[PDB]
Automatic annotation (TrEMBL), chains B, D:
<keyword id="KW-0812">Transmembrane</keyword>
<feature type="transmembrane region" description="Helical">
    <location>
        <begin position="119"/>
        <end position="141"/>
    </location>
</feature>
<protein>
    <submittedName>
        <fullName>Asparaginase</fullName>
        <ecNumber>3.5.1.1</ecNumber>
    </submittedName>
</protein>
<dbReference type="GO" id="GO:0004067">
    <property type="term" value="F:asparaginase activity"/>
</dbReference>
<dbReference type="Pfam" id="PF00710">
    <property type="entry name" value="Asparaginase"/>
</dbReference>
<keyword id="KW-0378">Hydrolase</keyword>
<dbReference type="InterPro" id="IPR027474">
    <property type="entry name" value="L-asparaginase_N"/>
</dbReference>
<keyword id="KW-0472">Membrane</keyword>
<dbReference type="InterPro" id="IPR036152">
    <property type="entry name" value="Asp/glu_Ase-like_sf"/>
</dbReference>
<dbReference type="InterPro" id="IPR037152">
    <property type="entry name" value="L-asparaginase_N_sf"/>
</dbReference>
<dbReference type="InterPro" id="IPR006034">
    <property type="entry name" value="Asparaginase/glutaminase-like"/>
</dbReference>
<keyword id="KW-1133">Transmembrane helix</keyword>
<feature type="active site" description="O-isoaspartyl threonine intermediate">
    <location>
        <position position="11"/>
    </location>
</feature>
<feature type="domain" description="L-asparaginase N-terminal">
    <location>
        <begin position="5"/>
        <end position="155"/>
    </location>
</feature>
Amino acid sequence: MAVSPSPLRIFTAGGTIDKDYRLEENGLVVGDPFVAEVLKTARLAGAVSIVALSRKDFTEADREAIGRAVGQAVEDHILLTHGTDTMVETARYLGGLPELAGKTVVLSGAMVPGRVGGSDAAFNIGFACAAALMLAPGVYIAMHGKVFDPAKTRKNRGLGRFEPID
Amino acid sequence: SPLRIFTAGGTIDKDYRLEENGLVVGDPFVAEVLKTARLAGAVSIVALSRKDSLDFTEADREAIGRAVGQAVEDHILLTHGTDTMVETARYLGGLPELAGKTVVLSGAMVPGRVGGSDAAFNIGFACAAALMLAPGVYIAMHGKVFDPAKTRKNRGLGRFEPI
Amino acid sequence: MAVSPSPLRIFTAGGTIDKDYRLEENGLVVGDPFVAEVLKTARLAGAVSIVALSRKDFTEADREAIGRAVGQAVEDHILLTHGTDTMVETARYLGGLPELAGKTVVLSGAMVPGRVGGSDAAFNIGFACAAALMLAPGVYIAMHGKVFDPAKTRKNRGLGRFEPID
Amino acid sequence: SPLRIFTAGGTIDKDYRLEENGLVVGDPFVAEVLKTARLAGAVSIVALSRKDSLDFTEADREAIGRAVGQAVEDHILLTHGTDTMVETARYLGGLPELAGKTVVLSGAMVPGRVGGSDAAFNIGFACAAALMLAPGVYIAMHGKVFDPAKTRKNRGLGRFEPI
Ligand SMILES: [Cl-]
Ligand SMILES: [Cl-]
């Protein structure tokens, strides 16, 4: 004999999930992709191709590059790790790209950096990988153990969570 | 829809005890993972057993089947030892009582309280599997969904594999 | 049976060692004292009284309060957890207080927050506790597995370490 | 002055192995702690043994004594199992060859690779003890310095205590 397929590709675009301390900045910067650290110890049957697109906390040019990389990917199952502050805008933009029509594209990340104690990151990565493999084609946000429709979602700062727009 | 989580012990929950000079099955690790998961939805955890999975009898499996049957929830995650996860999953897949439920078994090759554990990833993956898969019994391990009737644990590889 | 003594008192004055992520700030703040977390699992024979003096990354009034608390303590073995950026100035100020004459006073902390992966904090706390119990009376900085004389020490940003002044 | 660290295994270094379905003595945990300690001074680590301390013979202790004697350094940390740390420390305290050295034995009640371990604190404490104490053999555990000839492990308390 069997060959394990690798149907999921992951793109990383920085965000809180990848933040790490630097002595020079005397605080957090966007560091290496934390999803690579989670998948290293996941004992995967197959593998996951992880490609770093950008390392920002994020411009219109950056958004455009993400659409191109996702659209040019061979895989039909895609996970994009990203900051939560701009996740709805990125997700809605990807939603409007005809070339994504047959792909399941999930955005996720973490409210707490993976490299800070008490982070949601590893759970979110596991949930978002499953989501990207199991959901019908579309663009989704997977956070809080839930799937969100980008056109009907906002980040509620007071809650500290994404919430649906009724 | 509401997820119900049942804990049957196993490697995922193992923790060090001075008295034993080694690992024992401790408190359920899934509770530690979900505490920091910032969940939006309805979830509840129920402790069933703190055995090592090798020590399960026909009667431990019988009791697990009836316990899962007591849950009105249609989405079920059962955390369990990998050594007899296929036997429990096959047993549950044979119970007509459970046929409308999505039941996902998962756990970890390395205890969650040991460095470098698969446990958190596996819990996130299995929670999504329990919510997204059609009714049936499944093993969710290694970033994959296994059909219990067509799966074995391969000790040489340290993974479940298809038959 | 015997009664275990508690000869060490710890005062906390914030600093990098205690920094923790907050969703509201979208970055690090000075959080709860990390030394309390290290001592919780240290399986101490006796105990350590830990008193929080301040939570700053730090004014002249704050420096004065530290001198008062250290001087009024019953214990002759004192550990002050603190930011590294102002540690030499605090240490030199404590050095000039006659009321500290019979006390062993050690300042320490961490170049990386205790709640960030790959932190020096737990090692530094163990080393600094021993230092505060074992050194002769005086004021010291314990970092990098070494004891520094405050009057002959500077923080070298390029090295990322304290270094002696030759 | 230069510290030399010798590793003799024990609980501090235990790690989970799929093949054993449990803990084995693994790679020395002191190396993991010192990697992130941002040390200023001269330190070197030497592996002596990967036994569980219960399994030490008169000959394992003999070999440890001669190995510590091979170090020109006067400041020595030996990481070790707690179950026979008093026997090794008493043995070393009887060797005239070592009488100019400060030799500190330490370890952990909980493996460093298990959550909630004393190991990192104990390593920092013991490094300072090895640098600061007068020549002699000492156990540094529980934020305290023990005289080996006047110490026992109390299994009821889970700590070393004075006699
Ligand atoms: Cl920051
Ligand atoms: Cl074990």
